[PDB]
Structure prediction request, 191 residues.
Amino acid sequence: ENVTEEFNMWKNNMVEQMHTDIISLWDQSLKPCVKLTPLCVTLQCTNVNNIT
Amino acid sequence: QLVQSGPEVRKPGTSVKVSCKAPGNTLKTYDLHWVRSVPGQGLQWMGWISHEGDKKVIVERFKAKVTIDWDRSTNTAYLQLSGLTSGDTAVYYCAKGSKHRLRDYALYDDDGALNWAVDVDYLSNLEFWGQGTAVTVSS
Ligand SMILES: *[C@@H]1O[C@H](CO)[C@@H](O[C@@H]2O[C@H](CO)[C@@H](O[C@@H]3O[C@H](CO[C@H]4O[C@H](CO)[C@@H](O)[C@H](O)[C@@H]4O)[C@@H](O)[C@H](O[C@H]4O[C@H](CO)[C@@H](O)[C@H](O)[C@@H]4O[C@H]4O[C@H](CO)[C@@H](O)[C@H](O)[C@@H]4O)[C@@H]3O)[C@H](O)[C@H]2NC(C)=O)[C@H](O)[C@H]1NC(C)=O
Ligand SMILES: *[C@@H]1O[C@H](CO)[C@@H](O[C@@H]2O[C@H](CO)[C@@H](O[C@@H]3O[C@H](CO[C@H]4O[C@H](CO)[C@@H](O)[C@H](O)[C@@H]4O)[C@@H](O)[C@H](O[C@H]4O[C@H](CO)[C@@H](O)[C@H](O)[C@@H]4O)[C@@H]3O)[C@H](O)[C@H]2NC(C)=O)[C@H](O)[C@H]1NC(C)=O
Prediction:
């Protein structure tokens, strides 16, 4: 009660910190995952067949 | 068609040279073969040197005395004979053909590269043949 405080959504550091967080978790979840380098091979592709 | 060097006569002991030429440079992707035809004895396969320049196979029975060269700049096949015995008195034909470079056992790596591959190539056919050069050896 009786409390008035300034706010600044744009100078807020919480958003920056949590963006850095989300980036960190996203990378960390990918570290123990299967590497997919052997996929970069020539692909013999044809068009695909009951398609609108 | 193909062109071969004219008929030759040689005293036994020395060497002889045979040239097979294509018209211009229209036959470069096809591989090169040399064959021999002893009358009444069928035909023999002298050897071949492929077209990319990675093979030089010559049958061991004729390995010592026979050499096969290819001049890229002039697009000319060279056949050199050294012993020139009585058995070499026959007709030599230059042939242009195609092979099948199949890929046999190959060691891919963990990342998916190609460490090495024997990729032995198989003879398919000899479409184009020279007019034939007669080499006569007389004592
Ligand atoms: C996954 O991995 C497989 C591995 O087997 C691979 O299949 C093979 O690919 C190679 C690469 O092209 C093929 O090699 C060619 O084969 C043809 C013959 O193919 C016919 O016959 C086979 C059965 O033997 C059939 O299965 C096939 O469907 C065809 O009907 C050869 O004729 C080719 O030779 C040419 O290339 C050589 C160099 O590669 C030359 O030395 C040779 O002289 C030939 O020259 C050609 O090109 C010249 C210009 O460069 C031209 O002037 C000539 O006139 C001529 O046209 C070649 O060896 C092989 O057949 C495939 N199959 C097998 C069982 O090995 C797959 O492709 C691969 N998948 C990918 C990469 O997506
Ligand atoms: C990267 O990949 C490319 C192609 O994918 C390679 O290029 C070829 O490499 C091969 C080697 O595996 C080369 O083949 C060799 O060429 C030699 C050239 O010799 C010249 O001189 C002799 C006279 O001394 C001539 O008779 C000949 O026609 C040439 O004009 C040959 O001497 C070699 O012959 C030897 O091996 C063959 C079998 O391989 C035997 O039958 C022979 O008796 C002899 O012992 C051989 O043929 C080829 O020339 C290369 N071509 C090109 C266009 O470069 C690269 O080498 C490769 N590089 C790496 C680092 O991997």
User: Anything to note?
Assistant: Chain A touches chain B at residues 37-41 (CB under 8 Å). The pocket of ligand 2 is lined by residues B 53-56 (CB under 6 Å). The helical segments of chain A are 13-30.
